[PDB]
Amino acid sequence: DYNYGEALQKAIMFYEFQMSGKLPDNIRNNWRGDSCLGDGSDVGLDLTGGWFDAGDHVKFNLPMAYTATMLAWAVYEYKDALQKSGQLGYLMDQIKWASDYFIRCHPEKYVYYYQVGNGDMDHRWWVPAECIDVQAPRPSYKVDLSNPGSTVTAGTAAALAATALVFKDTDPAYAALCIRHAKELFDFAETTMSDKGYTAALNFYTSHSGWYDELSWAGAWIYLADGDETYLEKAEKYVDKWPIESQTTYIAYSWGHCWDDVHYGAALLLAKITNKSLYKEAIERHLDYWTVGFNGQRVRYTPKGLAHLTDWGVLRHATTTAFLACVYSDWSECPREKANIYIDFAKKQADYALGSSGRSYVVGFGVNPPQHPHHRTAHSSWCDSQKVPEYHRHVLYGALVGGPDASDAYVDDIGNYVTNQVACDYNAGFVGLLAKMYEKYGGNPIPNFMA
Ligand SMILES: OC[C@H]1O[C@@H](O[C@H]2[C@H](O)[C@@H](O)[C@H](O[C@H]3[C@H](O)[C@@H](O)[C@H](O[C@H]4[C@H](O)[C@@H](O)[C@H](O[C@H]5[C@H](O)[C@@H](O)[C@H](O[C@H]6[C@H](O)[C@@H](O)[C@H](O)O[C@@H]6CO)O[C@@H]5CO)O[C@@H]4CO)O[C@@H]3CO)O[C@@H]2CO)[C@H](O)[C@@H](O)[C@@H]1O
Ligand SMILES: [Ca+2]
């Protein structure tokens, strides 16, 4: 099969290319430099760090927090396989990079900065990250009690709780700090029950499915990290306000786990914590609908076997559902017949990202990978133009692209920010999927690999 170790190595390295702020000397590549060192200056804070969201230089905290949580989840489930691959250290460094930034965004219990950079203005400039902050201001945006944002604060709480979970055995003091922040952010979200102040991300990362699944998401992670039963109880309380499948009274099953809908993953977590049939039925309904089908309906598939939920970041969706399939099928309480269907599904989605259709969809990996991702800093224009140079100056190793259409059709095109898009949330579940594939099938990573 494909070299899952190499793919895992590169999928993790992808995040180094997304880093904002003062880079550590530990970094492997030689083309990224310090950037956006004034972030937060407009409000007197150090809000540097974190990840650029996609091929732009806005820091969008909702997908950033989702990403950090998923990366931590990969460590939690597959620590041993990640240590064997030699990549656990790099992944842990990235998790802490994001969470260090979330902490800086939380200077008071009820004040949280959820964005740095203006979307419309950042996107007018096709310039690399080391030059972006010379061309336009970069305002900071926040929510408070008078102007709240329950979705993003609860999402960040989940990220910091999961970070403490995986750092507990390494940096107890850091885990205790993350936990303290996570519980405060959760209270902030639950007390306000509103997204009125979550405005700067409008038309970029608007919350459409509600903050109640983010509360269950965060509550489960806080319980797994601290054991505080208060947050497990609250998690179960808000299940009744998760999205429901239209024309039914079921919990929604026909979409997938993503930055805007985290109730799928929360249902998996709450299943393993409590072993209640409510959560087991809901997740198995989901994963059944995505494999064999459920009640005569089934997620659509391309003829070449890709589970194709929607045209926007299709590989993101298929590899993230595949990751959830890995976790659930590894669980002893998963029916045996189901586990083999779910893990077969997961491997075929991984193989499709890596080359099964005839080409790889991971930049810098496999056969004929994408070469022109919609990414300003890997391209590196010298004149504010997507077309100049006609080849990217730098290889964005590990980046999973948007992907093909429902008939397996795709073409490289730097200008298509749907098919050729790359982003933090695209690679997040992907990392966890590749960890499992490495565990079960191996493939060695490249020795002494540097970009
Ligand atoms: O009911 C169905 C289920 O819906 C779920 O919610 C969905 C939601 O409905 C859907 O809308 C949402 O779609 C999001 C994508 O999934 C997500 O990947 C995407 O992230 C974008 C980000 O929004 C965007 O800012 C960024 O692209 C930038 C790009 O970097 C930049 O270069 C470009 O700049 C160009 C300018 O646009 C152009 O004017 C100028 O001329 O040229 C510039 C370049 O030179 O601008 C774009 C901005 O679009 O990329 C990232 C990466 O993709 O955001 C989407 C937000 O709508 O997904 C949700 C989750 O599936 C519910 O959750 C579920 O319950 C329902 O069942
Ligand atoms: Ca939500």
Angle at 258 between CA 47 and CA 439, to 5 degrees: 95
Range of the domain at 88: 1-451
Strand order of the β-sheet with 140-144 is 59-60, 111-116, 140-144
Please state, in angstroms and rounded to a whole number, the distance separating the CA atoms of residues 284 and 303. 24
Please state, in angstroms and rounded to a whole number, the distance separating the CA atoms of residues 400 and 352. 11
Residue 236, token pair as written in the block: 């179960």
Residue 187, token pair as written in the block: 């209270």
Torsion angle, alpha carbons of 426, 431, 437, 441, to 10: 130
**C-beta 258 within 6 A of ligand 1:** yes
**C-beta 235 within 6 A of ligand 1:** no
How far apart are the CA of 166 and the centre of ligand 2, in A?
A: 24
**C-beta 52 within 6 A of ligand 1:** no
The answer to whether 401 and 368 are in contact (CB under 8 A) is no
For atom 43 of ligand 1, the residue with the nearest CA is 123
447 preceded by a cis bond (ω within 30 of 0): no
Query: What is the domain count for the chain?
Result: 1
DSSP state of 367: S
Q: Is the dihedral of CA 323, 327, 333, 335 positive or negative?
A: positive
How far apart are the CA of 319 and the centre of ligand 1, in A?
A: 18
**Residue 197 half-sphere exposure toward CB, CA atoms < 13 A:** 22
Residue 350, token pair as written in the block: 């991984």
**C-beta 55 within 6 A of ligand 1:** yes
* Residue among 164, 154, 173 nearest 112 (CA): 154
Tokens 């890596």 appear where?
A: 354
Q: Are β-strands 111-116 and 59-60 bridged in parallel, bridged antiparallel, or unpaired? A: antiparallel
The answer to whether 53 and 426 are in contact (CB under 8 A) is no
Which residues contact residue 91 at a Cβ distance below 8 angstroms, ignoring those fewer than 6 apart? 12, 71, 74, 75, 82, 431
Report helix, strand or coil for 108: strand
